[PDB]
Design an enzyme around this catalytic site. Sequence first.
Site, PDB file in Angstrom:
ATOM      1  N   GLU A   1       2.834 -33.090  -7.041  1.00 37.27           N
ATOM      2  CA  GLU A   1       2.470 -31.736  -7.460  1.00 37.27           C
ATOM      3  C   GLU A   1       3.603 -31.107  -8.280  1.00 37.27           C
ATOM      4  O   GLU A   1       3.382 -30.529  -9.351  1.00 37.27           O
ATOM      5  CB  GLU A   1       2.177 -30.839  -6.245  1.00 37.27           C
ATOM      6  CG  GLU A   1       1.958 -29.367  -6.621  1.00 37.27           C
ATOM      7  CD  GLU A   1       1.780 -28.446  -5.413  1.00 37.27           C
ATOM      8  OE1 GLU A   1       2.560 -28.568  -4.438  1.00 37.27           O
ATOM      9  OE2 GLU A   1       0.874 -27.586  -5.434  1.00 37.27           O
TER      10      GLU A   1
ATOM     11  N   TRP B   1      -4.948 -29.569  -4.559  1.00 36.11           N
ATOM     12  CA  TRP B   1      -5.693 -28.614  -5.383  1.00 36.11           C
ATOM     13  C   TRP B   1      -7.190 -28.871  -5.521  1.00 36.11           C
ATOM     14  O   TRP B   1      -7.875 -28.177  -6.269  1.00 36.11           O
ATOM     15  CB  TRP B   1      -5.078 -28.546  -6.792  1.00 36.11           C
ATOM     16  CG  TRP B   1      -3.766 -27.831  -6.847  1.00 36.11           C
ATOM     17  CD1 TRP B   1      -2.531 -28.362  -6.622  1.00 36.11           C
ATOM     18  CD2 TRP B   1      -3.563 -26.431  -7.095  1.00 36.11           C
ATOM     19  NE1 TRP B   1      -1.570 -27.386  -6.712  1.00 36.11           N
ATOM     20  CE2 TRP B   1      -2.171 -26.190  -7.000  1.00 36.11           C
ATOM     21  CE3 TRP B   1      -4.422 -25.357  -7.386  1.00 36.11           C
ATOM     22  CZ2 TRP B   1      -1.615 -24.922  -7.187  1.00 36.11           C
ATOM     23  CZ3 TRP B   1      -3.871 -24.093  -7.569  1.00 36.11           C
ATOM     24  CH2 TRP B   1      -2.476 -23.887  -7.469  1.00 36.11           C
TER      25      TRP B   1
ATOM     26  N   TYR C   1       0.776 -22.205 -12.225  1.00 37.44           N
ATOM     27  CA  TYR C   1       2.167 -22.656 -12.166  1.00 37.44           C
ATOM     28  C   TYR C   1       2.682 -23.410 -13.396  1.00 37.44           C
ATOM     29  O   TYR C   1       3.379 -22.849 -14.229  1.00 37.44           O
ATOM     30  CB  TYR C   1       2.371 -23.529 -10.934  1.00 37.44           C
ATOM     31  CG  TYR C   1       2.205 -22.828  -9.606  1.00 37.44           C
ATOM     32  CD1 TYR C   1       3.183 -21.961  -9.115  1.00 37.44           C
ATOM     33  CD2 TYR C   1       1.079 -23.062  -8.821  1.00 37.44           C
ATOM     34  CE1 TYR C   1       3.032 -21.344  -7.856  1.00 37.44           C
ATOM     35  CE2 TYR C   1       0.921 -22.467  -7.589  1.00 37.44           C
ATOM     36  CZ  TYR C   1       1.895 -21.612  -7.103  1.00 37.44           C
ATOM     37  OH  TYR C   1       1.744 -21.056  -5.853  1.00 37.44           O
TER      38      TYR C   1
ATOM     39  N   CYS D   1       1.015 -18.265  -4.991  1.00 39.23           N
ATOM     40  CA  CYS D   1       1.515 -17.770  -3.716  1.00 39.23           C
ATOM     41  C   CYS D   1       3.037 -17.670  -3.824  1.00 39.23           C
ATOM     42  O   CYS D   1       3.662 -16.765  -3.268  1.00 39.23           O
ATOM     43  CB  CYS D   1       1.132 -18.732  -2.591  1.00 39.23           C
ATOM     44  SG  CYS D   1      -0.649 -19.115  -2.486  1.00 39.23           S
TER      45      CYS D   1
ATOM     46  N   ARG E   1       4.526 -14.492  -1.700  1.00 38.20           N
ATOM     47  CA  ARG E   1       3.743 -13.310  -1.368  1.00 38.20           C
ATOM     48  C   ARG E   1       2.831 -13.463  -0.162  1.00 38.20           C
ATOM     49  O   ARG E   1       2.639 -12.520   0.601  1.00 38.20           O
ATOM     50  CB  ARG E   1       2.893 -12.893  -2.572  1.00 38.20           C
ATOM     51  CG  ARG E   1       1.763 -13.855  -2.867  1.00 38.20           C
ATOM     52  CD  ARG E   1       0.861 -13.351  -3.976  1.00 38.20           C
ATOM     53  NE  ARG E   1      -0.155 -14.348  -4.287  1.00 38.20           N
ATOM     54  CZ  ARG E   1      -1.291 -14.510  -3.615  1.00 38.20           C
ATOM     55  NH1 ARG E   1      -1.575 -13.725  -2.587  1.00 38.20           N
ATOM     56  NH2 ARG E   1      -2.133 -15.479  -3.964  1.00 38.20           N
TER      57      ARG E   1
ATOM     58  N   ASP F   1       1.112 -19.191   4.782  1.00 37.84           N
ATOM     59  CA  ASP F   1       0.347 -19.784   5.867  1.00 37.84           C
ATOM     60  C   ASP F   1       1.333 -20.622   6.681  1.00 37.84           C
ATOM     61  O   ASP F   1       1.578 -21.794   6.393  1.00 37.84           O
ATOM     62  CB  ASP F   1      -0.786 -20.655   5.316  1.00 37.84           C
ATOM     63  CG  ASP F   1      -1.400 -21.555   6.381  1.00 37.84           C
ATOM     64  OD1 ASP F   1      -1.530 -21.107   7.544  1.00 37.84           O
ATOM     65  OD2 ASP F   1      -1.764 -22.705   6.051  1.00 37.84           O
TER      66      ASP F   1
END
Lengths: 542, 547
Positions: B321, B343, B369, B429, B449, B452
């Site tokens: 990633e 994703w 991103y 995120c 922000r 999890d």
Amino acid sequence: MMEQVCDVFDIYAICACCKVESKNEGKKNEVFNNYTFRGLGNKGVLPWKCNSLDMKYFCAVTTYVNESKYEKLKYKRCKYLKLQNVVVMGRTSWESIPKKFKPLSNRINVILSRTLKKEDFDEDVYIINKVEDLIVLLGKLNYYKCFIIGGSVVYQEFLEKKLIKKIYFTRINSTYECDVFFPEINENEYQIISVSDVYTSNNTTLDFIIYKKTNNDDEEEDDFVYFNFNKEKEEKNKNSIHPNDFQIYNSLKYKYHPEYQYLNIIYDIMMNGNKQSDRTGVGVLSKFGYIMKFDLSQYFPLLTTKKLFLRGIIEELLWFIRGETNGNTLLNKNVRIWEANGTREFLDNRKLFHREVNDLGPIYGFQWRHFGAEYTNMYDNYENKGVDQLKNIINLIKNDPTSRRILLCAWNVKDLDQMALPPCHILCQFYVFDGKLSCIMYQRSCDLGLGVPFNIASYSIFTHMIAQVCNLQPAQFIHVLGNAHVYNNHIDSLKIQLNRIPYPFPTLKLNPDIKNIEDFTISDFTIQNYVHHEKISMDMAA
Amino acid sequence: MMEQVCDVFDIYAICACCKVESKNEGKKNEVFNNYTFRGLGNKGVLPWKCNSLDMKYFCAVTTYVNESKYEKLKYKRCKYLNKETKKLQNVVVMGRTSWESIPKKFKPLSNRINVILSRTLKKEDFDEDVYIINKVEDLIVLLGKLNYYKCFIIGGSVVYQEFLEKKLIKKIYFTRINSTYECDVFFPEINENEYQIISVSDVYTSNNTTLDFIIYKKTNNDDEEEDDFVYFNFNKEKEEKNKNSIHPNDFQIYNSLKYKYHPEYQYLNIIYDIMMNGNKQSDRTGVGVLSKFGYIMKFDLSQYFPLLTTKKLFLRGIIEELLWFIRGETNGNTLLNKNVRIWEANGTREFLDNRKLFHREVNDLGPIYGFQWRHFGAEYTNMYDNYENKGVDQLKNIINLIKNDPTSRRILLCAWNVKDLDQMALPPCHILCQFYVFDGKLSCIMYQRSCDLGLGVPFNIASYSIFTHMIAQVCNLQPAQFIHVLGNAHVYNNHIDSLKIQLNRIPYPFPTLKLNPDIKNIEDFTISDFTIQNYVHHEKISMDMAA
Ligand SMILES: NC(=O)C1=CN([C@@H]2O[C@H](COP(=O)(O)OP(=O)(O)OC[C@H]3O[C@@H](n4cnc5c(N)ncnc54)[C@H](OP(=O)(O)O)[C@@H]3O)[C@@H](O)[C@H]2O)C=CC1
Ligand SMILES: NC(=O)C1=CN([C@@H]2O[C@H](COP(=O)(O)OP(=O)(O)OC[C@H]3O[C@@H](n4cnc5c(N)ncnc54)[C@H](OP(=O)(O)O)[C@@H]3O)[C@@H](O)[C@H]2O)C=CC1
Ligand SMILES: CC1(C)N=C(N)N=C(N)N1c1ccc(Cl)cc1
Ligand SMILES: CC1(C)N=C(N)N=C(N)N1c1ccc(Cl)cc1
């Protein structure tokens, strides 16, 4: 071999003084010091009536006892000559006490009076004749500690007799009418060693400080030392930064006042900061990453260890909200916060040769209201161009409060170069729960000596503004610092500042009528009960 | 109440254990437990030969004395023998072989009373100031005669064996050398019913290996300013709003610990804080979560790679990633063809439509991103377009600042492009990264922000730690601190039982991260350039027990 009574019989004092209204000046005071808080009583009663929090303190302190620690005391009290504490008081005081609660539940009650006769009272309630009388009475008794709960006259003499070990002083940060006041504590005799967190009770702020007479199971205990075997034997700038420079700062035992969150960071940077280069020419000490948290529901975090003015930063905030980029709008109101960044020389160094002086470019205001729009000049019409983030976050707060996308970002990567200066305050994230609003603000560059204090107040006020127009109560203001630095030319000033003990914080009152983020005006803000130390020029060269 | 020898005379054991070179029968997936660390010595010496930090710890522990407490200790021991009314040292007891393994210049151990167990040798055979004893019981008799602070059994295996066997050890100061070596001597398997880990130290790197210090405990079967502390805490509510849904007995092991200094506890404590004080809120289709606002974690990348150990974690996915990000890609197919499904859910027809991206091809994630990193500002068309020299190449830029203007307070990477949010399959995120450079060392702060904690955070921490390494390397710097800032931190309820379990697992020392030293350009990395070493971890925990 201690020949001091108060130290042997554990004679402490506890009070709560508020600010007194000077018939000369009024509420807004010109100078402050410890003797600012001295209001004791009015018309046989307390200046305020009921302070639900201070009450809880009074009780908790005078009713607390540690039985497993008593013998050590008696061992010496008898040598020098259900456990409970002793509470001495003057006649007048004992009288102002409401029947149902008198005599004080779970306390030893002793009234220092010369009219009162033993008989009228029950065996339980004692009655002394004078100062010296008390001492003996404490001998024929079994108690943990002895607290002088008043009144003025009792406090007065007891301070002269030097029979006080410590003073539990509650500072009520508000003004009331008074007739009796607490003696001016001689700073050569007693000194503050602890200052508590700041709170709000009965529509006023207050804190608790401690005055101390100036003297002038185990297996796991060693395990702590073992885990420290690799700790620093010394501090980087320990040498360059002397110790007798912070004796007061380092003399305190408990520094729970919120202001210390700022002061402690100053200390960390002065003691462990890294020395670095700086285009400005001068140098600085810097560290990376700090956090400060202020409970806006209990106080407004405006610094008190020095003087701070807020008109400028409030106007700047309103300027941002309007989405302006015109430095002239601030200069004409004598707010010169952005003046240096809008000069011919400054704009040219940024290579913005075709930029008019004071046209700051697509900074804060423009990003908050038109993110994405093409910037032309400060006079252009941008109505409905770009993304109105401010509007969006307010609608998110009102209609989707649990969202995790309530962010206001000023760091527009595409427009950094077009900005007179890239934003120091990167973004704002909001959080809502049980009708309360908290805010996180990330700052990439922080000048602790001059900018941070204003930065704290600025966003605290902003959190208040967003909360009000959304029908919420402000909760926490969380300040995240990235690059935190202290300018070397500020070290001397900061040293002076770290040795000043904070006063209880003031409060911010907003005009309740304003219901839209765009309707606030300078007169709509009022800072109340701001008690502070004298101004300090961080740059003492001028 | 009778007295127990080990307590009266304060007999402790201190050791160091590594991972043995045992067979693996070709099973990549090795099982781990405390017994994993058991390599005492080899061929008469230490398996690793020498380790500065551990030795410094050994010296610190065996020579530390607090002369204050002795008065109290003399009372105890004397009262035990029925007897009662110059620089205090500790006693070190060791076997014959251990003594012979010590280098002459270090014999006897300085500032310590050296006791040696032996049969084949007597006092006449020794030149040094030491005590000889031919049987354990003699040590007890001797201790009764000596004035010492604490007694430490420092090996070897035979010696540890008998002392634990005779139940004479009060606590075990155990060093876990997280690496494998040839061994021929082993520390006895500690009985979980006799001893329980009560403290875990910070993790460290010394002599090319990480290590930590843990303490096992023998299981059952100015003072006035103290009163002021009580006063100032008068406004404390000894209650926790979620204790009713989260019972105390569910954190026995976790709460039993005394010192929780292992970096992994920064994660675990946040989890615990959210379970005990979180806020109850809703989610996508009634899903419940507990949340708090604003946390911070710090990891010293110079001492270890913070890959969580209280559960198994694979990094092939998050590394690919990351390379996908660096290449500025937005094509979810690229990852799927490498069997990386991070994703996948966010690129389906259904997901894209729900986002109102009706004209977006399946798996065309949009300006996310990668795109923002290499082309912030450019107009997004489709995942196949050529964006060469379009938008701002933030990545390249931050690398130049780190190299040419290291003191800059502007080295930030931001994926939160306010204008493109809606065009993104999902808003980022991980909002931004700020870098800091000092004395050849690189630190990084990342603001997230939405977090999890149960699933995301463990991978987020590893991702950015690796990125800090990569950036540091192509900039000729050394990685330092990865600082993680959490905004909205939440725990999905479906994860609570799994997390309750995890919180009761003791962390193992962290592994290390190795990067091919030849890669000098942020863009030249490939999956085979990343190597995780000595990853000792607990069993994989499936957060969702309903799948
Ligand atoms: N904020 C705070 O911490 C406190 C506030 N207060 C407030 O202040 C007011 C009362 O204070 P104040 O006016 O000073 O009255 P006091 O409560 O101090 O009582 C004074 C009286 O007690 C006796 N007394 C005091 N000293 C001596 C002595 N050395 N020898 C013999 N008798 C002595 C005498 O009564 P006599 O001879 O007539 O019998 C004297 O007139 C009230 O309104 C109360 O609400 C009171 C205490 C604390
Ligand atoms: N990693 C770690 O923390 C430690 C590692 N080590 C390592 O382990 C190895 C040595 O361990 P090990 O082989 O077990 O040797 P030991 O150090 O345990 O010594 C065993 C010997 O000591 C004497 N001894 C032990 N118990 C008694 C007893 N009850 N009564 C009389 N004599 C006794 C006897 O020697 P004798 O023949 O004279 O009678 C016996 O053969 C080395 O490689 C060393 O480097 C050692 C300590 C700690
Ligand atoms: C409650 C109050 C005001 N608060 C403090 N901190 N100290 C005292 N001595 N008090 C007090 C208690 C009883 C009486 Cl009669 C007068 C003052
Ligand atoms: C140095 C070492 C390996 N380290 C620890 N923590 N514990 C021991 N017992 N050691 C030790 C001390 C003395 C001897 Cl002879 C052998 C090993």
